[PDB]
Amino acid sequence: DGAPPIMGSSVYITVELAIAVLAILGNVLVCWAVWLNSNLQNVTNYFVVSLAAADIAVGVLAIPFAITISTGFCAACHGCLFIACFVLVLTQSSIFSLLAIAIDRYIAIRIPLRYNGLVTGTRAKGIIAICWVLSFAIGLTPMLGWNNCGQPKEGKNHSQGCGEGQVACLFEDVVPMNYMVYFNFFACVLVPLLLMLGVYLRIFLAARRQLADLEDNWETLNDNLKVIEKADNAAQVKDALTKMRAAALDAQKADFRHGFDILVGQIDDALKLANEGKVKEAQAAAEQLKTTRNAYIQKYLERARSTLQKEVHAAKSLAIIVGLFALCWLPLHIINCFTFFCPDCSHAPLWLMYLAIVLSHTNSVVNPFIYAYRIREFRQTFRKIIRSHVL
């Protein structure tokens, strides 16, 4: 019978409302930016908007629900559940959006060739609708009978003076911890997180191998070239050109058709000279390759390299989003593991719980900062919106 609970409550409520303000405003800005900047209207950013929608709803609904449930007010058992579990629906929706973004970027880097034919806005819209419906079904599963409404706290319900059937609106009293640990954490959160880790691993490895391939083809072009200038045999020259020719048309698979046709044509010219024993003609006809290389091949192998670099830098930016999600949500999941798995442990203290709850809510405010910071197109669009509207 120490400090009045209203004092602790005041800090918690004030902080929660400060978070709600920032989650709403920042994520409204993201949606506004995607709405009037056609450079941002792609499939990838439709999942960004779905993710922003979930974070707006955290400020508008989940946080007010969190404040309400903290009071332990007397209400319907299934009413409490909805208040208690709605945040999950939003958290699950966030998981699906993050997973979809990963797969989208994976498809884009491995088969850029058939990316626009496979991944369309119409199909993305259908994927998003389905994921929202699945998120409701997963998040509100306790309302289907997996709850403690059948086992009410006799003592608490009489202390608070609830009516008949009514019950305080506690979180750990109505939502079973085996649902939270096994179903929600392990299956619905941790498994998708590990899948996202895997997808991003492949993204970075695919980028690393492609770059390499081009570097190998580029060095193959120039070495076989230097072998040409020193050889003394007709077949010695013909060997370095057939190997230079394979590397020519393979680098071609990674306006510019002209650059590669002059190159491969010049190699074939030098080939028939070599076959007819005309060594010095072959060596001199192969020496004009280096100006075709310096006027086309070099120009395309820098441009392909900078495109891959941008895809890597973009993938890193999106991976940070997933990292901060895990950082904000793992403490709460870990606390629940201790509650569930260690009955010999005294329960984590109230101040720590609420610190972990506050931390999970702040994850819906760092997003917009990552965007404007990591992605130029977002930053420039926010700049314009801020400077124009409503000034």
Ligand X SMILES: CC(C)CCC[C@@H](C)[C@H]1CC[C@H]2[C@@H]3CC=C4C[C@@H](O)CC[C@]4(C)[C@H]3CC[C@]12C
Ligand Y SMILES: CCCCCCCC/C=C\CCCCCCCC(=O)OC[C@H](O)CO
Ligand Z SMILES: Nc1nc(NCCc2ccc(O)cc2)nc2nc(-c3ccco3)nn12
Where do contacts with ligand X occur on this chain (CB under 6 A)?
61, 75-76, 79, 82-83, 330-331, 334-335, 337-338, 341-342, 345-346, 348, 352
Of these, 11, 187, 194, 212, which contacts ligand Y (CB under 6 A)? 11
Residue 313, burial from CB neighbour count under 10 angstroms (0-12, 13-18, 19+): exposed
Under the phi-then-psi rule, with left for phi > 0, alpha for psi from -120 to 50, and beta for the rest, what region is 175? beta
Distance of CA 169 to the CA centre of its chain: 35
Considering only residues 343 through 372, tell me which ones interact with ligand Z, judged by CB under 6 A. Answer: 350, 353, 357
172 binds, among ligand Z, ligand X, ligand Y, none (CB under 5 to 8 A by kind): ligand Z
> Is the alpha carbon torsion for 272, 273, 276, 279 positive or negative?
negative
Q: Which is nearer to ligand X, 76 or 195 (CB)?
A: 76
Contact assessment for residue 221 and residue 244, using Cβ atoms and an 8 Å cutoff:
yes
Angle between helices 234-251 and 191-230 (to 10 degrees): 150
Enter the DSSP assignment of 349: P
Considering only residues 165 through 224, tell me which ones interact with ligand Z, judged by CB under 6 A. Answer: 170-172, 180
Please report, as a single letter, which amino acid is at residue 210: Q
Q: Which is nearer to ligand Z, 117 or 155 (CB)?
A: 155
Smallest distance, ligand Z to C-beta of residue 19, A: 15
Tell me if 329 contacts ligand Y by CB under 6 A.
Answer: no
342 binds, among ligand X, ligand Y, ligand Z, none (CB under 5 to 8 A by kind): ligand X
Tell me if 342 contacts ligand Z by CB under 6 A.
Answer: no
Smallest distance, ligand Z to C-beta of residue 116, A: 38
Contacts 24+ apart (CB under 8 A), 256-259: 256/296, 256/300, 258/296, 259/292, 259/295, 259/296, 259/297, 259/299, 259/300
Of these, 30, 119, 132, 368, which contacts ligand Y (CB under 6 A)? 132
Q: Which is nearer to ligand X, 21 or 342 (CB)?
A: 342
The Cα 216–Cα 212 span in angstroms is 6
351 binds, among ligand Y, ligand X, ligand Z, none (CB under 5 to 8 A by kind): ligand Y
Tell me if 35 contacts ligand Y by CB under 6 A.
Answer: no
Considering only residues 316 through 335, tell me which ones interact with ligand Z, judged by CB under 6 A. Answer: 332-333
Please report, as a single letter, which amino acid is at residue 124: A
76 binds, among ligand Z, ligand Y, ligand X, none (CB under 5 to 8 A by kind): ligand X
Contact assessment for residue 249 and residue 264, using Cβ atoms and an 8 Å cutoff:
yes
Q: How far apart are the first and last CA of the chain?
A: 53
Site for ligand Y, rule CB under 6 A: 5, 8-9, 11-12, 15, 46, 49-50, 53, 57, 128, 132, 350-351, 354-355, 358
Binding site for ligand Z (CB under 6 A): 170-172, 180, 332-333, 336, 350, 353, 357
